[PDB]
Amino acid sequence: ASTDSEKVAEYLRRATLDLRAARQRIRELEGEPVAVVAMACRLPGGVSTPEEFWELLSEGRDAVAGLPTDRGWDLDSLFHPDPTRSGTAHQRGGGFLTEATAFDPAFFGMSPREALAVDPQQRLMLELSWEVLERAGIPPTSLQASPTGVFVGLIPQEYGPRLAEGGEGVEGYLMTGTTTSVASGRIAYTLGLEGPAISVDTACSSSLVAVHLACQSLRRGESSLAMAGGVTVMPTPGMLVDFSRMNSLAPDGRCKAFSAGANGFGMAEGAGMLLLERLSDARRNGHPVLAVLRGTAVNSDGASNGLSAPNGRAQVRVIQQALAESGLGPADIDAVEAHGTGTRLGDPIEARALFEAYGRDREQPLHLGSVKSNLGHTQAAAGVAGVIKMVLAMRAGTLPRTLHASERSKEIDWSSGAISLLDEPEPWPAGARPRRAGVSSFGISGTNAHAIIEEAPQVVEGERVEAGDVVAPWVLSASSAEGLRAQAARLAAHLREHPGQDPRDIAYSLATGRAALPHRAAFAPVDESAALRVLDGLATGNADGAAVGTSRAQQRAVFVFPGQGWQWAGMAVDLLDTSPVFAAALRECADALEPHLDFEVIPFLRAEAARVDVVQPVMFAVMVSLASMWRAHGVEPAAVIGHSQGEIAAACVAGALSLDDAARVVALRSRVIATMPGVPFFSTVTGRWTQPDELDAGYWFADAVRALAEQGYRTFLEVSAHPILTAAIEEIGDGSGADLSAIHSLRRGDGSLADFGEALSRAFAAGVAVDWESVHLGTGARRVPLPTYPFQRERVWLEP
Amino acid sequence: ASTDSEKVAEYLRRATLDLRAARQRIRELEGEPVAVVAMACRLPGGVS
């Protein structure tokens, strides 16, 4: 059968499937686009966050004021009005950072001496990395022993005294403090990553080159996350006074790109960092996507008329190569972020190259701009700044303005009109055609780089709306008291600025996200007004209505099963019906207990809200249900010292007898005790560490807690509607060793879930690990941007 | 023509050739060895 009809069809189908899979793999290996998750920046002026950068760009403002008077510069003989005297600069102004002199060595594991030895560049890079990691939404403490690449772009320069002469207290740390490799080695060591760490020095085009490398390791597959950035800062006026010898610096210090009055390029300083991930991986895990990088190209200009002389053919070739790698055409680009350094000779060459590379096949004019007009030349910090500007403009749907462009140059020809200089803001709305942009960077060494950036896919739309009645806790942590106070003040301020936010979104973002730190605060407000009230109360200093407490290197909790003493319970049908964990575990144990003890689950767990024969089995049942829900809520137990019925409860929890079997044995105990009236576990009646198997039929306060504390467990948690013997334990807390805290579960008739919210808030208040995804799970809460960590900086300088 | 093994055979052969070429390209793009042509050094002890 199947003669020549079915036999070959199956093989043909299999071969076609294999060919399709192989070609798909080829395409993925060659041209997989990458996605930008988050960005971080530090620019001259008051700019410290990308929002301020976009606000400055939209309002059209420059950030050039003068020179710094903090870094011990002479400032005086720096310009004898004769240009050619030794030690005479030419720039009477510029754009410089005002925060480089300050640092916070306490937050990191850094000693004041070696902190004084640390270069400002890596000093800024550490903060940039931490801020971008928090902005992405990934807890910075989760990235441990994982493949994550770091790529940095710097220029060595100099900071302090020479190594030969040494210092008085800081001698051994001089070498590591000033070295380009340590700039990324320190980041890798602090964050505990394991991917490649690379520092690249390729002049003003360094930063872009870095991201190019970050776009390759991700594509090949040697790393699953990349952090690429650049930095430039000046602790010495040497660069200006040496560049003035070439007479290439404009006096005032501005960039008049494509203007009739070009005089120089000026200098500045800054820092930028981006986080990159494969698009499929990022979308699989739900990480945010801001823009997509598709193709990059790096080239050299070859032999020219000197090292500083630029080339046009190389730029054209690199642009065409980037376009070919991206697999697009010259007509798919709407705007370009040209270099626009503002020099006399560079501008015509770059303009001609861009013309010949883009505008020959163009129906619509191409917009051109340069960020160096607003901020000046930032050396290696540039390149990434252009990328940030382009992505911000594309997201906001507006093209910003370029300054000092009202007087177009006279050495270039614009007869074709294919390139229109950006002098006024231009709307950039969404449409059928996706938006794309290109960024160029050229270095004085002779290396050129080009990149193409595209908008994120418009698939986020389609979110639904769901409501609920469960209130969720709010938590916030920091490493110092003032840090906690400032964080609370900033959160209250931001919540004041932006109204309409649901409590669920803020609760979820302040959930998994910010890391776990010594100083913690937690609460649970009904609405936002009382939330602001308690937040301002925390900001003032007196913590009332919330929970606080330091906890250094504490990660364990202890479950203790108290005996009788929580009587009258306060029947909670809401616990049984609202919580499904009860409605499963307690239901199972109850129907296990039903056949033996004639009493049903209907009669008194129906409750008349308005006898050891009955209570003890039901207290055991509700105890095991509560223990199950607690352990499912992320908090695991430890050795249990449960007394009386607590012995059977601990037997059930630690694995001595099964739920049905433990229920049956407690029913037998109740039936034999209703006549006379009228996993590591810690033994109670003997006081020893025992295995969970010896507990049998034959088996049926001070020294115990001393030994448990001496072991290393310093907290006690009892599952009871009313905490009993708490003071007895509490009095012991100061009596020996470290202090002891006991957390209640319920209150006097307060069976509402809000009581459990307070219990959880008190649990997190003192060194207890809680699985927040488990307690949130399904609520529809989505990520929401929040302010980053506020620091406490101090002056750290070392004069030469 | 003859039964039906006059058109399916050629298509199967072409598919096999294409699959072999694609897999060869993948292998070459992944693990192509790199041949070293020449070397130069300048080391202590008079080594040049």
Epitope: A1, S2, S5, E6, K7, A9, E10, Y11, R14 | S5, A9, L12
Partner: antibody, heavy 118, light 114 residues
């Protein structure tokens, strides 16, 4: 993907019927004539029977032994394959796999248990 | 009739150095069109069967490489260049000249050399 996910099974006394369902998904079920194979505990895999595609007629073939008590259904609307039992015996206790091809045994299912005893 | 295919029974292996299994036949399996109607199957311990090589020498997608089939229409062979610890189980030769294939045959076995 191209999951199969079989269903059915259990324990039945000798002389009884049962239904086994194979749920094709993730691919076009139009012309992918499937088959049923049986693996006894302690021995190798022995073929039970395949059902052709509707393009070539939708006929079926069986291999002796189980010829008179085994029937195959080809519900195209839900892309479901059915194996129907008839008067089972004790020696038929085996794990049943639902394949994908008729001559080239492609992606396999997960198997059932079905034991006959008393 | 049939070709009564057979294999060299059990073969213990060790991690590292390669291994191979031959497969003989009585009637040539080379079809007139110019192809060999043979394939190989692998059954893992306590798991569903799997397909490795079809039509003489062709690796199916998803196979973790390291497997190579070869041979003329009478003396087929399947060789593994690198032997790991998870590729242990039962291996079956299979033909396609006769459509009413009743059984997969005995099949060879592999284990850890000791």
């Amino acid at each position: 993907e191209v999951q199969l996910v079989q269903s059915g099974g259990g324990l039945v006394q000798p002389g009884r019927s049962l239904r086994l369902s194979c749920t094709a998904s993730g691919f076009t079920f139009g012309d992918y004539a499937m088959s049923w194979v049986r693996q006894a505990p302690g021995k190798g895999l022995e073929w039970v029977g395949f059902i052709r595609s509707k393009a070539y007629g939708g006929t079926t073939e069986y291999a002796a032994s189980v010829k008179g008590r085994f029937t195959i259904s080809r519900d195209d609307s839900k892309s479901i394959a059915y194996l129907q039992m008839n008067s089972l015996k004790t020696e038929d206790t085996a794990v049943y796999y639902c394949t994908r091809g008729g001559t080239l045994f492609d992606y396999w299912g997960q198997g059932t248990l079905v034991t006959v005893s008393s | 009739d049939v070709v009564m295919t057979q294999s060299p029974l059990s073969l213990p292996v060790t991690p590292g150095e390669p291994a191979s299994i031959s497969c003989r036949s009585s009637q040539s399996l080379l079809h007139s069109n110019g192809y060999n109607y043979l394939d190989w199957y692998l059954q893992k311990p306590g798991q569903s069967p799997q397909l490795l090589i079809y039509l003489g020498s062709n690796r199916a997608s998803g196979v973790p490489d390291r497997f190579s089939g070869s041979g003329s229409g009478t003396d087929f062979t399947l060789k593994i260049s690198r032997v790991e610890a998870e590729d242990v189980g039962v291996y079956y030769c299979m033909q396609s000249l006769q459509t009413p294939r009743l059984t997969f045959g005995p099949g060879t076995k592999v284990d850890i050399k000791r």
